[PDB]
Amino acid sequence: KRYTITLLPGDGIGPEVVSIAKNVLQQAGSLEGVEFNFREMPIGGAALDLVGVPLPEETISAAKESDAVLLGAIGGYKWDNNEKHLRPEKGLLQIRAALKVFANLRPATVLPQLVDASTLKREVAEGVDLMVVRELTGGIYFGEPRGIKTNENGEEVGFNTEVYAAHEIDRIARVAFETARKRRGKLCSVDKANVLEASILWRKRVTALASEYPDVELSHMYVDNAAMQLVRDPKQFDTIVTNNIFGDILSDEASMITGSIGMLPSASLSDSGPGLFEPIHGSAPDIAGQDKANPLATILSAAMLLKYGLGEEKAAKRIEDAVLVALNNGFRTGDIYSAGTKLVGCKEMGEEVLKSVDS
Amino acid sequence: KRYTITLLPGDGIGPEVVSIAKNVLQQAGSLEGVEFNFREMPIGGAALDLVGVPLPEETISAAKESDAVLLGAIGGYKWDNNEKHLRPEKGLLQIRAALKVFANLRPATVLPQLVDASTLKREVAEGVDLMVVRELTGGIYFGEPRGIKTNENGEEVGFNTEVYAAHEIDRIARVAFETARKRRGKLCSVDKANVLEASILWRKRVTALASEYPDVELSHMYVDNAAMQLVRDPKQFDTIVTNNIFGDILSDEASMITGSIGMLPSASLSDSGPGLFEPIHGSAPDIAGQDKANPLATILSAAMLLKYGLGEEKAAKRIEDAVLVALNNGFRTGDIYSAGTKLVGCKEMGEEVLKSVDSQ
Ligand SMILES: *NC(=O)c1ccc[n+]([C@@H]2O[C@H](COP(=O)([O-])OP(=O)(O)OC[C@H]3O[C@@H](n4cnc5c(N)ncnc54)[C@H](O)[C@@H]3O)[C@@H](O)[C@H]2O)c1
Ligand SMILES: *c1cc[n+]([C@@H]2O[C@H](COP(=O)([O-])OP(=O)(O)OC[C@H]3O[C@@H](n4cnc5c(N)ncnc54)[C@H](O)[C@@H]3O)[C@@H](O)[C@H]2O)cc1C(N)=O
Ligand SMILES: [Mg+2]
Ligand SMILES: [Mg+2]
DSSP: OEEEEEEEEESTTHHHHHHHHHHHHHHHHHHTTOEEEEEEOOOTHHHHHHTSSSSOHHHHHHHHHSSEEEEEEOOOSTTTTSOGGGSTHHHHHHHHHHTTOOEEEEEEEOOGGGTTTSSBOHHHHTTOEEEEEEEOSSGGGTOSSOEEEEOTTSOEEEEEEEEEEHHHHHHHHHHHHHHHHHTTSEEEEEEOTTTOHHHHHHHHHHHHHGGGOTTSEEEEEEHHHHHHHHHHOGGGOSEEEEOHHHHHHHHHHHHHHHTOGGGOEEEEEOSSSOEEEEESOOOOTTSTTTTOOOOHHHHHHHHHIIIIIIOOHHHHHHHHHHHHHHHHTTEEOGGGOOTTSEEOOSHHHHHHHHHHHHO | OEEEEEEEEESTTHHHHHHHHHHHHHHHHHHTTOEEEEEEOOOTHHHHHHTSSSSOHHHHHHHHTSSEEEEEEOOOGGGTTSOGGGOHHHHHHHHHHHHTOOEEEEEEEOOGGGTTTSSBOHHHHTTOEEEEEEEOSSSTTTOSSOEEEEOTTOOEEEEEEEEEEHHHHHHHHHHHHHHHHTTTSEEEEEEOTTTOHHHHHHHHHHHHHHTTOTTSEEEEEEHHHHHHHHHHOGGGOSEEEEOHHHHHHHHHHHHHHHTSGGGOEEEEEOSSSOEEEEESSOOOTTSTTTTOOOOHHHHHHHHHIIIIISOOHHHHHHHHHHHHHHHHTTEEOGGGOOTTSEEOOHHHHHHHHHHHHTTO
8 A cells, every 4th residue: 555755855954854754654654554655846945946946836746646745844044035936935835725735733732741841830731732723725824915015105015915715714614623523522713803804704604604513612712812821721722723824823832832843743634635744843944954853743744644644543643652652761852851851862863763663 | 290191991891900000090190299180081892882983082082182091901792793893992993093102012021929820830931021012003903905895706705904014114113122222132023024025024124223223132033933932931032023913912922921911011102192001901801890800910001101101200110119019918819829829809909009009
């Protein structure tokens, strides 16, 4: 049983972390009887240096033909000064649209081993287990009209439009509901409907679907409160559904509960289409090549790649299990270092994670 | 002296916290030879229930002609179902634009007594200090075009426009830099310039003014890292400048560092015009009339009114000191209750601040 996997290493620590996950992927899948066809294609800063655009057509077709796509990270200091159309991050947004992967899943759950690693008091952060369902292919990140023009004044004005059509909200809502059922049956839609006509529609469509999902209990919370709640009593959430710009911010805030931004993986899914799996981190421009980075998040994106994109649930559990063994043995990278643990770097963790897969 | 203060008690817990602050404002100013003309006006749900709109024209004029504006909060379940034009929250937005208070100062600094009140560990949260300078009157909260239309396929499509003109960015960056130089000399601009052309201009303009303030050490951070940073190592920030919507989010997150959202005051300032002072929290529909509320944010929001809006610094320090006295005496409301303290509600906590103002 063979699968075609496209690796998009990217920039920063992207290559570093993906190489590790690729090996974890081959070994874990091999134990459950699957081999893989790996194929590196350029994206972001890498593609810019090679072909001159952040996302070449050659990459998009290569990703579509594949069964699933594993991305590292994107962006870097060298290209921070390009035109808006030639920054690397523009490649990531395009690949999300190109793959039509609207439903973005970021699960932040605190492992018992990393409780001392969080910055939250133990009682606050122990046992947290929430899942963020973020709208990925629409909204202010993809909203038209946008740009910077110069009106008659001679003043520059920058503008983007946060815009969602109803069907865009509906599809992400069901995924929230379906997911919130698979968990603890509680769902929380986060918007800013006290001000934004976009958030008015957002809540309006989400309240609609609750009748179709009575197994799921829906509640609504404003985005400013939710950021505070994720620090006051983060244990409260089961599933949170929200839009692109709030999904990005809140999920990035939630990481520091589990111990670091380097612990969180993300699965980006579509109907039919092959899924896009990446870590929410990216892309450590300041510890690039120093071999300091935490690769766990990228490994788990390979876990999620198997679980959600290819359905090899058994293999994915082996991946989770290895990360658990590795942490039980005391191995921490810099960001998840606790007193009395063992501070490894990146290769030197991936190896002895792979020790656990292989045992 | 004799200043005119407009009290906008809003909704929810608004009335009680402002009432308590009104007494503290009165006494603290009174000790320094200062009197006040208090004029109460309807805003938000109160005004909807009275005249049928969130912000009556009579309220705006009364607010304009006063020296300082003291607001509680806005919003409540009763009015959550009105047409968009008729939402209490829109009155808040309207009074800010009407008063042209673009510079929003929300300072989150962790007090020694409330370290245990935080959910961040002591080492992380002890000595935290930061000030958020938020663009208040521009941005997505005020951007046109906006509305809910229907495209030809009959689908309802909602939209807002995040838009900043160059001068909108410039003046608030100036406030940020000016704030830093009185502070610890660090400024951190937060945007999403990897995706948003609005923020690209925000970055372009803010870096530009950096040449005018060599005294201030300016750094740039994307908003998603910013959220993780306020939890990873919040001791780092000195002054943070950002736009309307990112300011809302980040300032609420930063609140929990100091113990609860009920600790944070906010001053909103304008050129020449009288400023609008509110606590950053909402109307707390869940604790309203139970006398559970934390008044400190509003008592401290009254402190900012004296210091920043009226220049009565000595009286303003009287309010600040009293909050400290009450906290040294063990008094906590529910949101800032840490073990072995004395749990009180809103009305006595307020009396215990007053108890202490009148002791010096
Ligand atoms: N969706 C993406 O792939 C993505 C999201 C956001 C930004 N980028 C691009 O990366 C660089 C830099 O962005 P930052 O503002 O620096 O945010 P991060 O790069 O993730 O840095 C956060 C801090 O945490 C550290 N960190 C990240 N990942 C880590 C791991 N695995 N181990 C240890 N430490 C990690 C970082 O060093 C930071 O200190 C920009 O160009 C942006 O466009 C891509
Ligand atoms: C800015 C934004 C929104 N509002 C309006 O206020 C209404 C309340 O909704 P919300 O629950 O989402 O925000 P809120 O701050 O009210 O709630 C915060 C949570 O924390 C508790 N809490 C708040 N404030 C206090 C205080 N002062 N003391 C103790 N506990 C507090 C609350 O129980 C709650 O759980 C909503 O309609 C929204 O429209 C208002 C503002 C503004 N400045 O007016
Ligand atoms: Mg991010
Ligand atoms: Mg707020």
